[PDB]
C-alpha cells in the first residue's frame, strides 16, 4: 500500500526560528537514496530540530488492501495533497491544501505516480 | 581550525554588536570574545544579515560549534548558525605564548668577522607576533606617537640563532634573524558595530624608513631581547632553518655609521679622501650589498690600504672570486691575503657591454654588478662612457613587482573618492629627481624604452665633464615639438633596441612619396601606416656586414626617428626612398641599422586562437586529435633518431645549423653519447612543462612572417598572396591541391589563410582570405611576406585588431579544415583623444607619467579576466562581457601611446581559476572546456690540454655558482629548473636573464674557440688536438678528484 518510504535527515530550516508564529519549510536529504525534499510543517504543534532523522510514507488510501478514497496508528503527522505537476532527476509537486511539497529524487525512484491523483503523507520522527 | 574566526549565518537585523557580545558571554564563558563585527551595506544604519565573530581560544570555538550543532545557541527566537571564515577580523595568533609584549628590538650586522654585533638603533617595549599561518612575523614600533609595523616573512629570513645578553652561556636571552631580503614597513593612519576589544579602528599603509638614522635600511640582521624562556624555544623551533647550538655576541658600538641621505646601505666617500678608483669601489660594494661581507667588515682602513695599490686585473680577479664565495665571508683580509681596446671590438663584432643594473628597493638598493649584455644604439657613438650607463629597476623586497597598493592608495574624503599618494610614491620622486649616486658619480635620468616601462626599468648616465645628460637628449633630437607627456616618452625612448650597425647614408637622397588614404563610413582608414620601399643594391649593401646570402624581400628597418618595415620592388629609382607618415621626430643624426630581417619559424597555436576559434563550429575531436599525435610524436623522439632531426627541423629553425642537429641525422644509439641524450631529455621535459603552461600546438602547415605590400593595385578587397619556404615535410610530399610548388624551395598557397596576432580578444579577428597566384606578383620575386592589396573598404592590419605595418609578426597557416562560413565584423580602432599640453616639458609631468604607469596597470589580468569568463560561460565570445573585456584590453594596451587608464571594474574579477595555471593558492575549479580536455589529456599522458680543461672548469662553475646554477644542463640550455620568488611570477625577466646568461656562455665558448685557434694552428695538428682531447675526456681514469666537465670537446 506505501509506494515510497525512506529515512529522511532535515539539513536545515528556511525561516530558523523557534517561535516566529509562522509556517516553516524544512529541507531533509533521504539516506541511501539521494533525494532531496521540500516540505512546509508547523513546529509549533508539530517540533522537528536539525540533525533529527524521521521516517516518511507515501500511500494512496489509509486503509488495508483496497478501498481508495488503518494506518493512522502507526504515524502521527498524516496530511493529503493532490499532485499538480510531475515535470522535472525527476521532482513531485503536491500540494496538501496549500502547503507545497517538492520531493527531487532519482526518475528510477519516483515511477509509479500518476497526475492529478490523491495521495497521503505518512510521517513519524523515530 | 586554522583559524578563530566564525561566521554566524543569520541574525536579527535589529540587534546591535553589544546584544551579541553580551549573548555570546552569556552562554560561553565570560569575555571569551576578542572582535565582534557586523558588515553594514550602508555606512552606520544598515546592517546586513551575518556576522563574523572572533574567538580568543580554539576550545573556544570549538565549544561554541558543538552548541550550534545542537541548535542550543537561541538569541531572539533565531537559531544561530556557524560556519567557518574565510579570513581573520584582526591578524592576532591563537597561542598566548607567541604574544611577547615589552621587549627588546635591536637591529645591526655581522660587523666584526669574530662573535661581535653591532647595535644601530634600539627600541623598547616593541610588541612581537609570530603568525604560523600567515608564515611570517609582525613587529609594532612605537616611535613618537604614532606606531609602526615591520613584517618579516619565513623566506625573508634564512637561518635562526639563539644569544645571550646577561653574559650567562647557559641561559638564552637573544636571537638572530639573519635576514637576506628586507623587511616590509607600515604605519598607523587616524563603531556602533564593532567592539573590536581594543583601539584597532584604523589602516595600516606602507611607507618609508621611518627612524631618524635609518638604521633599518642599512641593516641585514634582527636581534631580540627576551627574557629566559624554559619553553621558548619551542616557540622559536618553528622558523625555517633553526640551528640548535649556543652562541654568544658581544655589544660593539657602532653607531658612528649613521647616513641621513636617502640611498643609505652605500659608503661614505669622504673616509677614503684618496684617488681610489671608481670600477673596485663599485664592486665593493656590490659585493657588501650581496650577503657575503657586512657593511663593517668592509669599512677598515687595513683593507683600503691593502686594496689601493696593486694589479688591477687581479684585483678585479680577487674581488669576483670572493663574489663567488659559496658561503658568508667574516675575514676578508685573510682571505685577499690566502688568495695571492677590447670594448670596441666587442661592441662592432657582437654588440657586448658591460652594463651596470641596480635594484631600488623602499629599504635599500641592490647593486648586482657588471652584468653582460646586448648593447644598444645610444652606446655605439658613446662608448668610452662605458661605466656610466647604469639600468635602474624600481622592484619591492622580493624583488618582485610593486603591488598597486603599496603607491597611492585610495581614500575617500568629502563627497568624492581622491587618491592619497604613499610614501613609496615621494621617495621614488625623490630618486628620480634628485638621482642616485654611487662614489664619485651621479646618474641622471635620460630616457626609457617601451619594454622597460612595463618593467619599471630606466636608463641612468653619470654627467661627465666631457658629456652630460642634457647634451645625449640633445643629440638624440629635439623633443620639444612633441606636446603629449606619453608620445614624448616613447619618442625620447624608441631609440634603445639591440640593433646592427651599417653604413652611414647623408640627407640629400630621399624621396617624399605621397600616400593613399581612405575614408567611408564616417570613420579614417590609412592603409600606409608603416609602409615603406627599398631597392635591391640597398638589400645587397646591407646584408654584407650581417652575413646574409639570400636577400629577403622585407626586413624592418629605423633610422633618424623614423620606423617601419621596407619592401623590395624592381623598378627602383634610387637607393632609399621615404613617405610621408614616417617621420616621428626631428634628429641630428640619420645613422642606419637593422633589427630583424626574416624568420621563417613554424606557427604555434596559443590560447587565444583555440579560445576564440572554439565557437566557428570547430569541434573537440580535432583538437584532442592533434594532441594525441603531438605527444605520441613527443615520445617517440627518445628511442628513435629519425624523429629527432624532423623534430629539431619543424619546431625551431627551418634553416638551422647546430652540433645536435648534425647528429641527429647521422649518432649513434640514443643509449650512448649521454652528452646529448641527457640534452634531449632536458628539451623534452622543458617542452612538456610550456605545455603545462600554456597551450602551443605544433603546425607544420604554417608560418609566422612579417607583411607588407606592392605598387601594384590588382589585389582586391579579400585577395592576398601567400607564399613561404619548404620544410622538411613540405619537401618529402609537395603534392597537394592547396600547395603549389612554384620553386625547389618555395611554394606558393592557394588555400584558406587566416591573419592572427598574439593579442587577440575579438570574434571578428577571424578573416577568412583566399591567396590567389599571379605570374606578375611572381615576377617581382616576394618572398618571406604576405602581400597585402592597396584599394579596398579598410585595410588589412586595421582588421587585425587595428595594427600597422611596423614589422609586426603575422600568423599565417594554408590549412583547409577550418570552417571560413562564419564571419564576423571586427572592432573599432579608434583610439582616445591625445591629450595636448600648453607648455614644454619641465622633466617633471614625465616622472609623474612614468611613476603613474605602476598604478592602474592592469595589463595581465584582463587576459585572465576574459579566458577565464570565456572557459566559464557557454557561448564564449559573443556575449557583451567579451566585448567589455576587448575594449578594455585596447584601452590598455594604449595607455604606453596615451595617458589613458584601463580602469578595471571590480565585478569583472574572476575570483576563480582553472586547473591549468599556477596560481596553487587561489581556489582551483574544475573546466570542462576544451583547454580542460586538453590537460587532462596531458596529464594523463605525462602520468696543455690539461690546463685549458682546468680553466674552463673552473669558468663554468664560476658562472653556475654566479647565477645559482647547480648543474650543467640548466646552464647551458638557460632554463633554470629552479625559481625564485619573483622569476616565477613574471615571464619577461626571466626571458632577459636568460638571454643574459646565453650571451655569457656564448662569449664563453667564442673564448674557447680563441684559445683553440690560437693554441695549435695546423690543420692536422689540431684534428689530432682534438681527438687526443676527445679520448682524453671519454677515459673515466683521466677524471680528478673534482668534478670534470665533459662539455669542453664538443664545439662543434
Keep these: 500500500i506505501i509506494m515510497f518510504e525512506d529515512i529522511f535527515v532535515v539539513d536545515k530550516l528556511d525561516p530558523d526560528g523557534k517561535k516566529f508564529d509562522k509556517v516553516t519549510r524544512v529541507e531533509a536529504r533521504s539516506h541511501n537514496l539521494e533525494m532531496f525534499m521540500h516540505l512546509d510543517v508547523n513546529t509549533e504543534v508539530y517540533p522537528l530540530a536539525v540533525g533529527d532523522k524521521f521516517t516518511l510514507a507515501m500511500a494512496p488510501t489509509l486503509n488495508l488492501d483496497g478501498t481508495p478514497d488503518t494506518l493512522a496508528d502507526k504515524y502521527e503527522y498524516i496530511m493529503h495533497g493532490k499532485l499538480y505537476k510531475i515535470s522535472e532527476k525527476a521532482e513531485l509537486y503536491v500540494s496538501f491544501g496549500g502547503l507545497l511539497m517538492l520531493l527531487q529524487?532519482?526518475?528510477?525512484?519516483?515511477?509509479?505516480?500518476?497526475?492529478?491523483?490523491?495521495?497521503?503523507?505518512?510521517?513519524?520522527?523515530? | 581550525t586554522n583559524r578563530s574566526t566564525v561566521k554566524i549565518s543569520n541574525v536579527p537585523q535589529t540587534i546591535v554588536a553589544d546584544e551579541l557580545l553580551r549573548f555570546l558571554e552569556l552562554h560561553l564563558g565570560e569575555d571569551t570574545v576578542f572582535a565582534?563585527?557586523?558588515?553594514?551595506?550602508?555606512?552606520?544604519?544598515?546592517?546586513?544579515?551575518?556576522?563574523?565573530?572572533?574567538?580568543?581560544?580554539?576550545?573556544?570555538?570549538?565549544?561554541?560549534?558543538?552548541?550550534?550543532?545542537?541548535?542550543?545557541?537561541?538569541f531572539k527566537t533565531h537559531n544561530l548558525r556557524l560556519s567557518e571564515a574565510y579570513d581573520d577580523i584582526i591578524p592576532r595568533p591563537v597561542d598566548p605564548r607567541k604574544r611577547l609584549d615589552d621587549i627588546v628590538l635591536t637591529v645591526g650586522f655581522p660587523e666584526s668577522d669574530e662573535k661581535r654585533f653591532c647595535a644601530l638603533e634600539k627600541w623598547d617595549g616593541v610588541r612581537?607576533?609570530?603568525?604560523?599561518?600567515?608564515?611570517?612575523?609582525?613587529?609594532?614600533?612605537?616611535?613618537?606617537?604614532?606606531?609602526?609595523?615591520?613584517?618579516?616573512?619565513?623566506?625573508?629570513?634564512?637561518?635562526?640563532?639563539?644569544?645571550?645578553?646577561?653574559?650567562?652561556?647557559?641561559?638564552?636571552?637573544?636571537?638572530?634573524?639573519?635576514?637576506?631580503?628586507?623587511?616590509?614597513?607600515?604605519?598607523?593612519?587616524?563603531?556602533?558595530?564593532?567592539?573590536?576589544?581594543?583601539?584597532?579602528?584604523?589602516?595600516?599603509?606602507?611607507?618609508?624608513?621611518?627612524?631618524?638614522?635609518?638604521?633599518?635600511?642599512?641593516?641585514?640582521?634582527?636581534?631580540?631581547?627576551?627574557?629566559?624562556?624554559?619553553?621558548?624555544?619551542?616557540?622559536?623551533?618553528?622558523?625555517?632553518?633553526?640551528?640548535?647550538?649556543?652562541?654568544?655576541?658581544?655589544?660593539?658600538?657602532?653607531?658612528?655609521?649613521?647616513?641621513?641621505?636617502?640611498?643609505?646601505?652605500?659608503?661614505?666617500?669622504?673616509?677614503?679622501?684618496?684617488?681610489?678608483?671608481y670600477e673596485i669601489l663599485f664592486q665593493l660594494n656590490a659585493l657588501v650589498h650581496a650577503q657575503k661581507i657586512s657593511l663593517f667588515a668592509a669599512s677598515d682602513m687595513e683593507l683600503i690600504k691593502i686594496l689601493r695599490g696593486m694589479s688591477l686585473e687581479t684585483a678585479l680577479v680577487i674581488l669576483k672570486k670572493l663574489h663567488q664565495q659559496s658561503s658568508i665571508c667574516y675575514d676578508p683580509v685573510f682571505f685577499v691575503k690566502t688568495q695571492m681596446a677590447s670594448a670596441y671590438?666587442?661592441?662592432?663584432?657582437?654588440?657586448?657591454?658591460?652594463?651596470?643594473?641596480?635594484?631600488?628597493?623602499?629599504?635599500?638598493?641592490?647593486?648586482?654588478?657588471?652584468?653582460?649584455?646586448?648593447?644598444?644604439?645610444?652606446?655605439?657613438?658613446?662608448?668610452?662612457?662605458?661605466?656610466?650607463?647604469?639600468?635602474?629597476?624600481?622592484?619591492?623586497?622580493?624583488?618582485?613587482?610593486?603591488?598597486?597598493?603599496?603607491?597611492?592608495?585610495?581614500?575617500?574624503?568629502?563627497?568624492?573618492?581622491?587618491?592619497?599618494?604613499?610614501?613609496?610614491?615621494?621617495?621614488?620622486?625623490?630618486?628620480?629627481?634628485?638621482?642616485?649616486?654611487?662614489?664619485?658619480?651621479?646618474?641622471?635620468?635620460?630616457?626609457?624604452?617601451?619594454?622597460?616601462?612595463?618593467?619599471?626599468?630606466?636608463?641612468?648616465?653619470?654627467?661627465?665633464?666631457?658629456?652630460?645628460?642634457?647634451?645625449?637628449?640633445?643629440?638624440?633630437?629635439?623633443?620639444?615639438?612633441?606636446?603629449?607627456?606619453?608620445?614624448?616618452?616613447?619618442?625620447?625612448?624608441?631609440?634603445?633596441?639591440?640593433?646592427?650597425?651599417?653604413?652611414?647614408?647623408?640627407?640629400?637622397?630621399?624621396?617624399?612619396?605621397?600616400?593613399?588614404?581612405?575614408?567611408?563610413?564616417?570613420?579614417?582608414?590609412?592603409?600606409?601606416?608603416?609602409?615603406?620601399?627599398?631597392?635591391?643594391?640597398?638589400?645587397?649593401?646591407?646584408?654584407?656586414?650581417?652575413?646574409?646570402?639570400?636577400?629577403?624581400?622585407?626586413?624592418?628597418?629605423?633610422?633618424?626617428?623614423?620606423?617601419?618595415?621596407?619592401?623590395?620592388?624592381?623598378?627602383?629609382?634610387?637607393?632609399?626612398?621615404?613617405?610621408?607618415?614616417?617621420?616621428?621626430?626631428?634628429?641630428?643624426?640619420?645613422?642606419l641599422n637593422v633589427t630583424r630581417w626574416t624568420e621563417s619559424m613554424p606557427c604555434f597555436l596559443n590560447r587565444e586562437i583555440i579560445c576564440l576559434l572554439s565557437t566557428l563550429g570547430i569541434e573537440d575531436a580535432m583538437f584532442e586529435a592533434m594532441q594525441a599525435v603531438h605527444l605520441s610524436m613527443l615520445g617517440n623522439m627518445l628511442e628513435d633518431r629519425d624523429a629527432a632531426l624532423n623534430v629539431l627541423q619543424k619546431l625551431s629553425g627551418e634553416n638551422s645549423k647546430n652540433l645536435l642537429v648534425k647528429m641527429l641525422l647521422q649518432g649513434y644509439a640514443p643509449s650512448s653519447e649521454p652528452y646529448l641524450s641527457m640534452m634531449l631529455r632536458v628539451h623534452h621535459e622543458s617542452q612538456l612543462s610550456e605545455l603545462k603552461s600554456r597551450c602551443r600546438i605544433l603546425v607544420p602547415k604554417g608560418r609566422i612572417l612579417i607583411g607588407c605590400m606592392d605598387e601594384m593595385?590588382?589585389?582586391?578587397?579579400?585577395?592576398?598572396?601567400?607564399?613561404?619556404?619548404?620544410?622538411?615535410?613540405?619537401?618529402?610530399?609537395?603534392?597537394?591541391?592547396?600547395?603549389?610548388?612554384?620553386?625547389?624551395?618555395?611554394?606558393?598557397?592557394?588555400?584558406?589563410?587566416?591573419?592572427?596576432?598574439?593579442?587577440?580578444?575579438?570574434?571578428?579577428?577571424?578573416?577568412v582570405l583566399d591567396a590567389i597566384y599571379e605570374v606578375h606578383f611572381e615576377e617581382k620575386g616576394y618572398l618571406d611576406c604576405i602581400i597585402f592589396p592597396q584599394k579596398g573598404e579598410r585595410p588589412h592590419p586595421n582588421e587585425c585588431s587595428g595594427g600597422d605595418l611596423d614589422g609586426d609578426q603575422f600568423f599565417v597557416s594554408w590549412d583547409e579544415k577550418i570552417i571560413p562560413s562564419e564571419m564576423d565584423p571586427p572592432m573599432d580602432y579608434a583610439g582616445s583623444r591625445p591629450r595636448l599640453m600648453d607648455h614644454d616639458v619641465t622633466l617633471e609631468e614625465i616622472h609623474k607619467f612614468f611613476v603613474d604607469y605602476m598604478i592602474s596597470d592592469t595589463l595581465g589580468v584582463i587576459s585572465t579576466a576574459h579566458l577565464v569568463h570565456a572557459d566559464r560561460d557557454p557561448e564564449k565570445a559573443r556575449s557583451q562581457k567579451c566585448l567589455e573585456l576587448a575594449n578594455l584590453h585596447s584601452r590598455a594596451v594604449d595607455f604606453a601611446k596615451t595617458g589613458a587608464p584601463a580602469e578595471m571594474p571590480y565585478a569583472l574579477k574572476p575570483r576563480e581559476f582553472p586547473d591549468f595555471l599556477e596560481r596553487?593558492?587561489?581556489?582551483?575549479?574544475?573546466?570542462?572546456?576544451?583547454?580542460?580536455?586538453?590537460?587532462?589529456?596531458?596529464?594523463?599522458?605525462?602520468?696543455?690540454?690539461?690546463?685549458?680543461?682546468?680553466?674552463?672548469?673552473?669558468?663554468?662553475?664560476?658562472?653556475?655558482?654566479?647565477?645559482?646554477?647547480?648543474?650543467?644542463?640548466?646552464?647551458?640550455?638557460?632554463?633554470?629548473?629552479?625559481?625564485?620568488?619573483?622569476?616565477?611570477?613574471?615571464?619577461?625577466?626571466?626571458?632577459?636573464?636568460?638571454?643574459?646568461?646565453?650571451?655569457?656562455?656564448?662569449?664563453?665558448?667564442?673564448?674557447?674557440?680563441?684559445?683553440?685557434?690560437?693554441?695549435?694552428?695546423?690543420?692536422?695538428?689540431?684534428?689530432?688536438?682534438?681527438?687526443?682531447?676527445?679520448?682524453?675526456?671519454?677515459?673515466?681514469?683521466?677524471?680528478?678528484?673534482?668534478?670534470?666537465?665533459?662539455?669542453?670537446?664538443?664545439?662543434?
Design chain 1, 105 to 126: 529524487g532519482d526518475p528510477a525512484h519516483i515511477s509509479h505516480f500518476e497526475l492529478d491523483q490523491r495521495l497521503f503523507l505518512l510521517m513519524r520522527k523515530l
Design chain 2, 36 to 74: 565582534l563585527e557586523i558588515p553594514t551595506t550602508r555606512d552606520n544604519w544598515k546592517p546586513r544579515d551575518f556576522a563574523r565573530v572572533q574567538f580568543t581560544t580554539l576550545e573556544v570555538k570549538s565549544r561554541a560549534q558543538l552548541l550550534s550543532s545542537q541548535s542550543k545557541l537561541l
Design chain 2, 128 to 277: 612581537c607576533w609570530i603568525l604560523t599561518e600567515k608564515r611570517r612575523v609582525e613587529f609594532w614600533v612605537w616611535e613618537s606617537g604614532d606606531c609602526y609595523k615591520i613584517e618579516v616573512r619565513f623566506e625573508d629570513i634564512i637561518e635562526t640563532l639563539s644569544c645571550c645578553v646577561n653574559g650567562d652561556a647557559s641561559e638564552i636571552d637573544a636571537f638572530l634573524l639573519k635576514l637576506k631580503y628586507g623587511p616590509k614597513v607600515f604605519k598607523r593612519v587616524t563603531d556602533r558595530y564593532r567592539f573590536c576589544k581594543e583601539d584597532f579602528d584604523f589602516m595600516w599603509i606602507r611607507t618609508t624608513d621611518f627612524s631618524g638614522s635609518k638604521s633599518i635600511g642599512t641593516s641585514t640582521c634582527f636581534c631580540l631581547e627576551v627574557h629566559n624562556g624554559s619553553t621558548m624555544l619551542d616557540i622559536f623551533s618553528g622558523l625555517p632553518y633553526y640551528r640548535e647550538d649556543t652562541l654568544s655576541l658581544t655589544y660593539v658600538d657602532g653607531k658612528t655609521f649613521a647616513s641621513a641621505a636617502q640611498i643609505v646601505p652605500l659608503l661614505n666617500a669622504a673616509i677614503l679622501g684618496l684617488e681610489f678608483p
Design chain 2, 345 to 591: 671590438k666587442r661592441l662592432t663584432e657582437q654588440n657586448i657591454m658591460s652594463c651596470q643594473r641596480a635594484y631600488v628597493t623602499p629599504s635599500k638598493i641592490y647593486l648586482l654588478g657588471p652584468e653582460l649584455e646586448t648593447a644598444n644604439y645610444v652606446v655605439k657613438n658613446f662608448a668610452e662612457h662605458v661605466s656610466d650607463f647604469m639600468r635602474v629597476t624600481f622592484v619591492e623586497e622580493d624583488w618582485s613587482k610593486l603591488p598597486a597598493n603599496a603607491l597611492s592608495v585610495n581614500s575617500k574624503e568629502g563627497y568624492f573618492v581622491k587618491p592619497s599618494r604613499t610614501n613609496i610614491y615621494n621617495r621614488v620622486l625623490s630618486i628620480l629627481g634628485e638621482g642616485i649616486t654611487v662614489g664619485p658619480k651621479r646618474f641622471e635620468f635620460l630616457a626609457f624604452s617601451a619594454s622597460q616601462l612595463r618593467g619599471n626599468s630606466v636608463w641612468m648616465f653619470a654627467s661627465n665633464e666631457k658629456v652630460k645628460a642634457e647634451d645625449i637628449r640633445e643629440w638624440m633630437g629635439c623633443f620639444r615639438k612633441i606636446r603629449s607627456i606619453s608620445k614624448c616618452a616613447a619618442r625620447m625612448g624608441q631609440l634603445f633596441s639591440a640593433s646592427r650597425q651599417t653604413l652611414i647614408v647623408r640627407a640629400q637622397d630621399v624621396e617624399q612619396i605621397p600616400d593613399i588614404e581612405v575614408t567611408t563610413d564616417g570613420a579614417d582608414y590609412c592603409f600606409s601606416d608603416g609602409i615603406g620601399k627599398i631597392s635591391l643594391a640597398f638589400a645587397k649593401q646591407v646584408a654584407q656586414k650581417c652575413g646574409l646570402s639570400h636577400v629577403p624581400s622585407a626586413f624592418q628597418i629605423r633610422y633618424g626617428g623614423y620606423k617601419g618595415v621596407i619592401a623590395v620592388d624592381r623598378s627602383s629609382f634610387r637607393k632609399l626612398s621615404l613617405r610621408d607618415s614616417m617621420l616621428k621626430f626631428d634628429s641630428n643624426n640619420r645613422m
Design chain 2, 713 to 767: 593595385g590588382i589585389l582586391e578587397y579579400g585577395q592576398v598572396y601567400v607564399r613561404v619556404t619548404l620544410t622538411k615535410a613540405e619537401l618529402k610530399s609537395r603534392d597537394q591541391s592547396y600547395f603549389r610548388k612554384i620553386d625547389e624551395e618555395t611554394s606558393v598557397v592557394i588555400g584558406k589563410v587566416v591573419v592572427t596576432k598574439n593579442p587577440c580578444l575579438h570574434p571578428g579577428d577571424i578573416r
Design chain 2, 920 to 1052: 596553487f593558492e587561489k581556489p582551483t575549479y574544475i573546466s570542462e572546456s576544451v583547454f580542460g580536455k586538453l590537460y587532462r589529456a596531458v596529464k594523463s599522458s605525462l602520468a696543455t690540454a690539461k690546463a685549458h680543461r682546468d680553466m674552463y672548469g673552473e669558468k663554468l662553475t664560476s658562472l653556475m655558482i654566479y647565477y645559482g646554477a647547480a648543474n650543467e644542463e640548466e646552464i647551458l640550455t638557460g632554463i633554470l629548473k629552479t625559481k625564485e620568488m619573483y622569476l616565477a611570477r613574471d615571464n619577461r625577466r626571466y626571458g632577459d636573464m636568460k638571454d643574459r646568461i646565453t650571451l655569457s656562455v656564448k662569449d664563453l665558448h667564442k673564448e674557447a674557440m680563441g684559445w683553440f685557434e690560437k693554441s695549435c694552428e695546423d690543420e692536422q695538428q689540431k684534428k689530432k688536438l682534438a681527438s687526443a682531447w676527445y679520448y682524453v675526456t671519454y677515459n673515466p681514469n683521466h677524471r680528478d678528484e673534482k668534478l670534470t666537465f665533459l662539455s669542453f670537446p664538443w664545439i662543434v
